[PDB]
Amino acid sequence: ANTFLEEVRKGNLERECVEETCSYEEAFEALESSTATDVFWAKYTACETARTPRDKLAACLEGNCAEGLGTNYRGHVNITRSGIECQLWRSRYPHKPEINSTTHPGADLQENFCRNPDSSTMGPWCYTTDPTVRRQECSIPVCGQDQVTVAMTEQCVPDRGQQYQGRLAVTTHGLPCLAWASAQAKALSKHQDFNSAVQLVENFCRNPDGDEEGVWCYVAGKPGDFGYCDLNYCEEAVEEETSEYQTFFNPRTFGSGEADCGLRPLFEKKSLEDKTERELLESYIDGRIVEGSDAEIGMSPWQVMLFRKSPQELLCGASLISDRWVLTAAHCLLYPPWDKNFTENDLLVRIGKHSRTRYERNIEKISMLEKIYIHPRYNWRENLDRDIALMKLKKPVAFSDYIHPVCLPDRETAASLLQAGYKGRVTGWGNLKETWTANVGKGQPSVLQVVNLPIVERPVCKDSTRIRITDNMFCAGYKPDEGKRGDACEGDSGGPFVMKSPFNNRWYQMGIVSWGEGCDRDGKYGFYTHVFRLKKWIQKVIDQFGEYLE
Ligand SMILES: *[C@@H]1O[C@H](CO)[C@@H](O[C@@H]2O[C@H](CO)[C@@H](O)[C@H](O)[C@H]2NC(C)=O)[C@H](O)[C@H]1NC(C)=O
Numbered sequence: 168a169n170t171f172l173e174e175v176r177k178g179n180l181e182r183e184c185v186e187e188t189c190s191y192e193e194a195f196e197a198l199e200s201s202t203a204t205d206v207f208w209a210k211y212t213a214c215e216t217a218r219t220p221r222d223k224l225a226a227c228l229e230g231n232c233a234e235g236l237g238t239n240y241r242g243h244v245n246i247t248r249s250g251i252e253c254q255l256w257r258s259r260y261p262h263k264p265e266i267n268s269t270t271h272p273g274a275d276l277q278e279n280f281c282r283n284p285d286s287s288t289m290g291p292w293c294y295t296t297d298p299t300v301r302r303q304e305c306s307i308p309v310c311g312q313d314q315v316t317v318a319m320t321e322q323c324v325p326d327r328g329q330q331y332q333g334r335l336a337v338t339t340h341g342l343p344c345l346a347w348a349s350a351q352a353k354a355l356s357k358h359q360d361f362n363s364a365v366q367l368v369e370n371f372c373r374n375p376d377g378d379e380e381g382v383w384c385y386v387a388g389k390p391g392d393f394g395y396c397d398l399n400y401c402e403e404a405v406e407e408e409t410s411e412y413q414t415f416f417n418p419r420t421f422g423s424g425e426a427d428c429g430l431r432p433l434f435e436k437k438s439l440e441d442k443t444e445r446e447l448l449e450s451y452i453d454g455r456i457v458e459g460s461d462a463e464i465g466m467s468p469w470q471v472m473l474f475r476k477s478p479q480e481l482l483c484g485a486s487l488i489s490d491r492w493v494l495t496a497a498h499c500l501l502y503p504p505w506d507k508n509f510t511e512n513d514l515l516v517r518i519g520k521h522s523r524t525r526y527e528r529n530i531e532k533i534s535m536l537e538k539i540y541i542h543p544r545y546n547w548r549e550n551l552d553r554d555i556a557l558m559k560l561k562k563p564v565a566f567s568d569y570i571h572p573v574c575l576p577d578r579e580t581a582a583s584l585l586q587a588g589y590k591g592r593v594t595g596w597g598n599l600k601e602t603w604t605a606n607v608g609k610g611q612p613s614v615l616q617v618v619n620l621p622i623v624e625r626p627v628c629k630d631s632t633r634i635r636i637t638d639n640m641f642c643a644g645y646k647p648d649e650g651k652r653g654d655a656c657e658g659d660s661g662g663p664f665v666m667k668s669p670f671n672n673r674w675y676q677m678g679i680v681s682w683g684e685g686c687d688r689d690g691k692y693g694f695y696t697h698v699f700r701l702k703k704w705i706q707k708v709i710d711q712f713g714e715y716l717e
Pocket residue numbers: 266267268269270
């Protein structure tokens with residue numbers, strides 16, 4: 168281009184090299200320059216597999232798109248697939264390259280443009296300005312195709328970190344990861360269903376087990392301890408993702424109950440509806456309010472109460488997910504702003520209860536706690552993020568018509584349930600309100616209560632506050648009235664929010680009741696921590712406990 172002489176040489180290249188095959192020498196006789204000829208030839212070699220038809224080759228040679236592995240690529244894309252700015256090939260900050268002009272002279276390693284000097288299978292790539300990610304591939308258009316090499320993400324990490332190749336090696340608590348190849352680390356990976364596509368390099372954070380929470384690593388302490396690492400995952404609100412019951416856990420460690428979860432002895436098992444199942448459609452009475460009321464006996468047999476031993480005192484709700492594991496909120500156990508830090512032997516639980524106030528010797532059962540597991544991502548300094556805990560009973564509990572576990576949903580189930588046209592349900596003894604407010608007037612209920620609440624669209628729930636709602640929370644409740652406090656502070660603190668599957672007829676815990684502005688302020692919705700990402704954390708906790716035995 169530009170010079171006349173050059174424009175002639177361009178036409179000759181077209182005639183002899185593009186419309187026809189040419190030799191290096193033929194090419195040189197046309198360009199009359201070793202450099203120019205080497206430059207051309209490297210492209211011509213990169214386009215070996217795309218020599219016909221002519222336009223296919225012309226496109227490949229222009230270099231604005233990747234053909235095959237994209238050694239042909241010569242375009243000006245600056246950024247990684249995840250949006251990280253590419254490091255200059257000539258720089259050594261933050262990474263010091265191993266591939267340069269000298270090692271790969273025909274690769275056109277200029278500025279910080281994505282290239283594929285090493286014929287890497289992920290296509291053109293660059294060293295990144297993120298000191299925790301050495302190299303990453305870029306999203307390049309494919310030649311002759313409405314398509315790109317790898318999907319773009321908007322400055323965030325996809326697939327819950329399963330593509331992550333970086334070198335972050337501390338957990339969110341600043342705990343150093345251990346090496347995956349370390350003896351104790353190998354002993355715990357022994358027979359896990361680790362995806363071999365995830366490379367377990369050094370002690371870098373990885374997600375080899377498909378954990379919905381994201382990347383993690385083992386850390387020093389008790390054998391099997393681990394923690395999650397801070398990556399900026401893409402906002403994936405499960406609300407908006409487009410039969411039978413299959414068990415996830417191992418009964419030897421989870422305990423009994425999963426197979427039969429979510430089917431109540433006194434209702435589903437007798438083919439009887441409870442009094443408010445009939446009002447569970449969002450369309451019920453045009454969607455208008457229906458106030459809470461006394462529960463029927465045994466209509467929420469996974470309900471659990473957490474008590475201080477001395478002074479005897481009701482602390483929190485909780486939920487039964489097997490015969491030995493119980494799910495609640497971490498703030499129930501550890502909340503430094505109230506100087507709260509309860510140990511196992513401070514507490515007990517009561518299961519199968521109906522009356523708050525009475526010892527119900529025919530139905531209720533008392534269990535002690537063996538261990539408490541606070542979620543490793545729990546953070547109270549922020550906004551009660553991952554306000555979740557798991558408790559292990561000292562002895563398993565006996566199931567009965569009043570004591571039965573609830574199901575836990577995975578991601579598919581959760582998206583499915585938030586999107587069928589049914590409300591959710593909160594039951595308890597008003598412990599949230601009692602704990603978090605002065606609760607004047609209306610006393611605490613003496614009998615288990617129930618109310619049903621419709622799920623609220625995430626953008627509407629977002630506009631109901633100036634608080635940032637992470638994708639791990641959701642709102643539920645009826646159209647508020649800014650004149651009235653409404654019923655946005657229902658249930659027990661740490662207690663269950665549940666929904667019934669219209670597909671397999673079982674009850675699933677979708678949420679854990681957390682504190683929300685509803686407790687203090689008009690015009691709000693109730694606020695619930697998602698549980699759908701927890702399964703692989705739980706699975707790892709129940710192995711950590713397997714080790715606890717010696
Ligand atoms: C690209 O890498 C080469 C290979 O390591 C670098 O060349 C070496 O540089 C050291 C000095 O730092 C010399 O002592 C060696 O003799 C060189 N080895 C060879 C085989 O040349 C080179 O300097 C790097 N180039 C850039 C642009 O960073």
